[PDB]
Design a protein around this nucleic acid. Sequence first.
RNA 1: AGGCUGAUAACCUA
RNA 2: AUUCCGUUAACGAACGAGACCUCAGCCUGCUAACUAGCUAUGCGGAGGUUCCCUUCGCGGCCAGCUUCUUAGAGGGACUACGGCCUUUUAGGCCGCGGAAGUUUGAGGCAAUAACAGGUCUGUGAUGCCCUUAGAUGUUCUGGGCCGCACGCGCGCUACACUGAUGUAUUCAACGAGCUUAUAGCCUUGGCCGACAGGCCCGGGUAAUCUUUGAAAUUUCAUCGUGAUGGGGAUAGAUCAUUGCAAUUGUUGGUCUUCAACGAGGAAUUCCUAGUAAGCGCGAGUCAUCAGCUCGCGUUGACUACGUCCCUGCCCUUUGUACACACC
RNA 3: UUGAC
Lengths: 140, 140, 185, 75, 64, 142, 104, 50
Amino acid sequence: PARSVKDVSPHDFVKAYAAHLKRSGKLELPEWTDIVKTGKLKELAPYDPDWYYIRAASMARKIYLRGGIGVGGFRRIYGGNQRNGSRPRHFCKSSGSVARHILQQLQTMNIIDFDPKGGRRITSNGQRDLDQVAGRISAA
Amino acid sequence: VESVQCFGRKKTAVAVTHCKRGRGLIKINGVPIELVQPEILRYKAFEPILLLGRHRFAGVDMRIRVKGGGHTSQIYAIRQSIAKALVAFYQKYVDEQQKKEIKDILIRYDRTLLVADPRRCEPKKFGGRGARSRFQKSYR
Amino acid sequence: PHTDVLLFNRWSYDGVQIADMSVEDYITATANKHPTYMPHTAGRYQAKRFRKAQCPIVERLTNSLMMHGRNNGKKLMAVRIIKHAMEIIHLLTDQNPIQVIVDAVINSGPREDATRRQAVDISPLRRVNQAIYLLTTGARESAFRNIKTIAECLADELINAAKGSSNSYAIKKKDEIERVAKANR
Amino acid sequence: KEKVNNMVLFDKGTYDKLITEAPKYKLITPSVLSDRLRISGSLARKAIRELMAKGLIRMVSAHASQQIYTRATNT
Amino acid sequence: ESVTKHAIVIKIMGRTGSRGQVTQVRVKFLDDQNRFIMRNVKGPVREGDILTLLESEREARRLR
Amino acid sequence: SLVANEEFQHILRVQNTNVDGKQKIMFALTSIKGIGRRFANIACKKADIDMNKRAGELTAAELDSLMVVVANPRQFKIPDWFLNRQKDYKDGKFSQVTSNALDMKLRDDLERLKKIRNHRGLRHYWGLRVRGQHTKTTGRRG
Amino acid sequence: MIHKIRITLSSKNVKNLEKVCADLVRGAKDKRLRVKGPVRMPTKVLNITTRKSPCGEGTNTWDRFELRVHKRVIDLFSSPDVVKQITSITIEPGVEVEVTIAES
Amino acid sequence: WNAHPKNYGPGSRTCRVCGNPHAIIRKYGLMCCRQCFRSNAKEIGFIKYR
RNA sequence: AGGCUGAUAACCUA
RNA sequence: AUUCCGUUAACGAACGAGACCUCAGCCUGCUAACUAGCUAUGCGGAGGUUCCCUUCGCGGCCAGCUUCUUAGAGGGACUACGGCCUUUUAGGCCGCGGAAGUUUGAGGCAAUAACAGGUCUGUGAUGCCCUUAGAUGUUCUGGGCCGCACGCGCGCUACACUGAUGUAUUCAACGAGCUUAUAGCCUUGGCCGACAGGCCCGGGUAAUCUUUGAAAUUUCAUCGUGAUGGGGAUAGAUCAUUGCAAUUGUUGGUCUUCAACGAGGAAUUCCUAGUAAGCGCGAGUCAUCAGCUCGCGUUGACUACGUCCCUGCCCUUUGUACACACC
RNA sequence: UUGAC
Ligand SMILES: [K+]
Ligand SMILES: [K+]
Ligand SMILES: [K+]
Ligand SMILES: [K+]
Ligand SMILES: [K+]
Ligand SMILES: [K+]
Ligand SMILES: [K+]
Ligand SMILES: [Mg+2]
Ligand SMILES: [Mg+2]
Ligand SMILES: [Mg+2]
Ligand SMILES: [Mg+2]
Ligand SMILES: [Mg+2]
Ligand SMILES: [Mg+2]
Ligand SMILES: [Mg+2]
Ligand SMILES: [Mg+2]
Ligand SMILES: [Mg+2]
Ligand SMILES: [Mg+2]
Ligand SMILES: [Mg+2]
Ligand SMILES: [Mg+2]
Ligand SMILES: [Mg+2]
Ligand SMILES: [Zn+2]
């Protein structure tokens, strides 16, 4: 067979493609990578030192699967439950600066572009890049 | 065009399996069924294949679309749509006696493989937070 | 008889026997009585009396793990716990984990009780219900505020109960129930 | 109710006990080692990885919540 | 001394006890199938199912 | 995994506080007043300290570099919004105040309000709630 | 020459709405016009839930009030003048007819 | 006289039927108090089914 | 002081 | 079920119950959809080996079609069928088949006679009484309704490892939405910002746009039985938003502070299946404010299939010095 | 006699 993104486990793919983005050296991490949290719903900053590449790999896989997602859509996708002390939990959005910065980097890498109807769309080069990485993952 | 389209239901989940003459492909929304999530419910979705055997599916291609419901109910809807689609395919394009044989196997194992569960959520009534549950009563 | 259905696709129902006349018809763990690949069926077992005796014994154990309130309805976690516990049981005992589970249920079911107080006999169905309740109550209590995981506690509870050892929480409670019953004869 | 005092790092005496006795256990989990060797669960998780690297124990089940290991060779 | 025996339920006499929590049944001993007695049973029981009697000498009074 | 060497310490002393040596360094620093989990984590990153090791494994030099970060956050580019004393009332400066300096700062805040007979200062003096909470039914501990 | 004209019908009364829809489709089939519909939009259920008591005493009972709106859409391929002729027929009470030239 | 702003809040809105300011139903633009609405519900077109 | 009682006494708990 | 069969000095009727109406459950049958889709086909992108295969995007009022969606009309269950039990009865138990075999589930409606039950503070419903210009009318400014030794009721969050945290991953339903004034409602997309929030271009008076629309859960890692990374009260500093106005913190952020609480005495509530419980969402209120209420779905059990012991209710017989009726 | 107990 010939595996593409849909044919491989999402967990395995994101790890492999994140190591691919870091290895290329094309993403320019912002100054505040080590300081920020990924939303006000969080208590602490991410544990993984390479969380930025992991998030960028995850966002590329979602644009590959569905076009037209904007920054607001990604804030919802990585949002979740916020705890409010002695009050009930409610849904909260995640950081827009993290989403916007990652999208603007993947676009300079030519993995995504502007969808005419709004949001971001995977490019032909982006499709090849993601599909080639998925093909190299060992069968597991 | 020897194809059938059978649905399965569980609560608000609806899965429709498009079963056509093929070579044995089985995919859910473009993803191979071997990657069904969650992984512990993967056994439930594979029961029709395990019960009948892969050799019964060698001459068909099943593409499944599922919507609504939740993680558990979508598996049961998918599980039901696959069984119904194969039975509808054998009746229409293979034989009546072969349809008789496989349907007996599916029924002897579990009747919900072919017959939907009619249970739905009971509406909430005022004076309590559930359908039955009432607000706590105090006297003094 | 023989069946191709394996629990979790790991454990065989062949060779599993219920060596107790009273509760044989109320434990569903053999190859002839509807073997199941997984202990998760959206069954309707409360529609009628004695209908839950057809529910597989492994799934009846899984349901009793969805306590207390914090764990209500978290059946995917419960199925995982029993899946891990059976793996642990196989390592420690070198026996079929399904066979060990039925032995634990048979040994931990009280056969006499007190009511009103005088001694009365317990029906085979309630005996199975009590055994399941006692086994999961002991595992839950030993896991609480303990480094030991719930799966390891459940495996040890079942291994001791299947052996008949007093180390089991369910064996001690069964003795206490039958000790008070004899005092009120 | 007394408080456990689980060591966060091995000492020469306990580390040698791990390399000799632990490979012989039928069931090896972080909580089994944590209780037998009086080590914290965090140290037990790292210790199990070392035993895996040395090839002294084989894996039976892997789950984020429950990890199950056993002696590589029986008896 | 008490000897454990197994007996099969023949007929359901009726629910007894203050709150109806007990059932009186007629049981036939399996070892000797010509002996019948009445027993009080806690929990759901139906005709046909088998019981374990820790002591078989006692007998329950009708409508106890 | 690794064996502890003789340099391992079970108790440390930082800014007149007892720091447990068996705790992960990130959570060992939180025992200092004015340093929470968010600030302890950023301090270890700016000091290039491996957060995977225990506080007792750190050398004396490494432990000191942590307190240099805490004392000069702006020098290490920790932003102003991340500090527990932003735009001080007297000096207007931004800083992270810890241990007794934090206790002195809290004392000066309440004394200032009480001195001008501010409403919030008076409720601090009377031992009442100051953040608009109803007091009819809760907070009954006297 | 031939244009897709959209007719929208709304009403609270289903029988009256279905009666007018049949009169229009059947009235257009007589002229041999191409007809698309009627298309039934999902029913809009306006809902007001209110306390029965005019005061606050007694068991707190609630009245659930519902006002259902049914909507039909019929597309006729013909000229505006012909459509104006078909729709000009007297319409049943409470049925709101709305003729627009589909923007396509 | 009447100088205080009345652009928002209960004081700005009143029942269209009776003029009372309490328990106004603003949904769908009804602008009736809950008591007047129940009296006039049938005439407005609202009905009880379940 | 709380609980039990429509309420009081009795009773039960702290 | 005062539901029926029968009995019978009654006969024949009227209400309530049932019927009924709404929602839900079955229909590969009917009607028919560019504001809902599917299948096929054409073109294009990517992967694998030019055909071919896998996957995604776009197009076609002359591809076809209605399985999935919507909503009209109908059909479908009657305990029909089998066994047994009951009086020839009325009916009941078990079972096949069946979407469904508790009046299939859940509601709405709902008799006679009552209560000195609640409401004059919903009403341009209202009698009498009071007040009516140093007003109990009305409006304006400010404060109060929230004030805190204490007692009680409905709740929310917890005491952790069946967990918290950080990743990765991923599936609902009910519903609601604007005066267009630069723009007053729901808001996509782009940009700026760590967050909170701001700017710009727009869509939608709506199966068309928001809506590509949740959480618990799943998954990997860290933590390791320590009031601990459990818990988040109390409190300091500071930033932003709503408003004419935020102090007695409106609310929302950031760092810091880090209380009780280790499962709860006597007592006591609710609940029999998609129910309990857990999990979040919409709506009402609303400039701003939800720990509340009314609905919605998601995950999904234990136990019982009884009894009149407790608390009550219905019918019959019976006792009564009670009729304001055993308070 | 009817109710209530
Ligand atoms: K998320
Ligand atoms: K107080
Ligand atoms: K292609
Ligand atoms: K009134
Ligand atoms: K009056
Ligand atoms: K009012
Ligand atoms: K706090
Ligand atoms: Mg600190
Ligand atoms: Mg206040
Ligand atoms: Mg259809
Ligand atoms: Mg119908
Ligand atoms: Mg009545
Ligand atoms: Mg009165
Ligand atoms: Mg008040
Ligand atoms: Mg209430
Ligand atoms: Mg916490
Ligand atoms: Mg979705
Ligand atoms: Mg703490
Ligand atoms: Mg307010
Ligand atoms: Mg309220
Ligand atoms: Zn009004």
